[PDB]
């Protein structure tokens, strides 16, 4: 499964599901797309 966003995240390692993104500012995911 994934992570919805806010949850804390890799974004290398992006565990969180596409149309979110995993931020490296935030370091966590995000929907930004």
Do not use: H, I, Q, V
């Amino acid at each position: 499964d994934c992570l919805g966003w806010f949850k804390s995240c890799d974004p290398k390692n992006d565990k969180c599901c596409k149309n979110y993104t995993c931020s490296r500012r935030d370091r966590w995911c995000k929907y930004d797309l």
